[PDB]
């Protein structure tokens, strides 16, 4: 594949990383 597809995925994964970490910190705290 084109390597730059990883940067496009990075944009989507980074938003869900932020969602997942904040919801996680709220559940465990």
């Amino acid at each position, epitope marked *: 594949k*084109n390597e*730059q597809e*990883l*940067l496009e995925l990075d*944009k989507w994964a*980074s938003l869900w*990383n*932020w969602f997942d970490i904040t919801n996680w910190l709220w559940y465990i705290r």
Partner: antibody
Framework: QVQLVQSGSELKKPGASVKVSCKAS????????MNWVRQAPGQGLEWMGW????????TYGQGFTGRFVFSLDTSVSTAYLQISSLKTEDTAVYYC????????????????????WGKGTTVTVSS | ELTQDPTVSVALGQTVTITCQGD??????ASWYQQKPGQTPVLLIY???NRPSGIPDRFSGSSSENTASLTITGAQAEDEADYYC????????????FGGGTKLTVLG
């Protein structure tokens, strides 16, 4: 011979616009991202943003919105940086580099690196 | 990475560690670049500790907590230069930053 060749030095008046070029050689241009870096006099390196060389979509770094436009001419393996409404403080060396990305060990994460660099273009803005 | 010591000093043959500190370094690795006066930057270390083929074995990369480090083993005169770390910043959307840079002085 994998290399990036940048356009020559330039002088502009405040309020004008400038277009700097970055031509890739020795590899397939649209297979890798390109990024731009600014270095003002006596200062450090600053991330300006990157451009998808497969689609032409630009992603501007924080602080480089509005007056900065990334574009490409894939038919000649060249990426462009246009700065509009130039200010004296835009005086700097502008680098293009190949922006590489690879998957990290942790899912959803990546690492990045700039493996090939152009020699820089000096842009001076003065009255 | 975000913050980086402005100046650092070494002695020929000794080892020195240049360190960048930033919250994003807890999740993303850093790459490290050398820039000598008037020269274009050169990639030294990527993905925390991988070395391009042209780079001498003196240069090593590491990471710990919110910090990433470049270490030089056999410090020589040719290593007197500026060193910059690069990684993601703290923005939710993908954005990148250079550290402020470290001037290395090799004494003796």
């Amino acid at each position: 011979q994998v290399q990036l060749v940048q356009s020559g030095s330039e002088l502009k008046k405040p309020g004008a616009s400038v277009k700097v070029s970055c031509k890739a050689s020795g590899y397939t241009f649209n297979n890798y991202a390109m990024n731009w870096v600014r270095q003002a006099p006596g200062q450090g390196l600053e991330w300006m943003g990157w451009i998808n060389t497969n689609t032409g979509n630009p992603t501007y770094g924080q602080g480089f919105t509005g007056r900065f436009v990334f574009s490409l001419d894939t038919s000649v393996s060249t990426a462009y940086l246009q700065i509009s409404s130039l200010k004296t403080e835009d005086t700097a060396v502008y680098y293009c580099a190949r922006f590489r990305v690879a998957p990290a060990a942790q899912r959803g994460y990546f690492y990045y690196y700039m493996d090939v660099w152009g020699k820089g273009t000096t842009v001076t803005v003065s009255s | 990475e975000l913050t980086q010591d402005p100046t650092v000093s070494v002695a020929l043959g000794q080892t020195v560690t240049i360190t960048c500190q930033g919250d994003s370094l807890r999740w993303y690795s850093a790459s490290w670049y050398q820039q000598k006066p008037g020269q274009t930057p050169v990639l030294l270390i990527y993905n925390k500790d991988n070395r391009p083929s042209g780079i001498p074995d003196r240069f090593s990369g590491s990471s710990s907590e919110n910090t990433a480090s470049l270490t030089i083993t056999g410090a020589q005169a040719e290593d007197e230069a500026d060193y910059y770390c690069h990684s993601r910043d703290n923005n939710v959307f993908p954005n990148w930053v250079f550290g402020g840079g470290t001037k290395l002085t090799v004494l003796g």
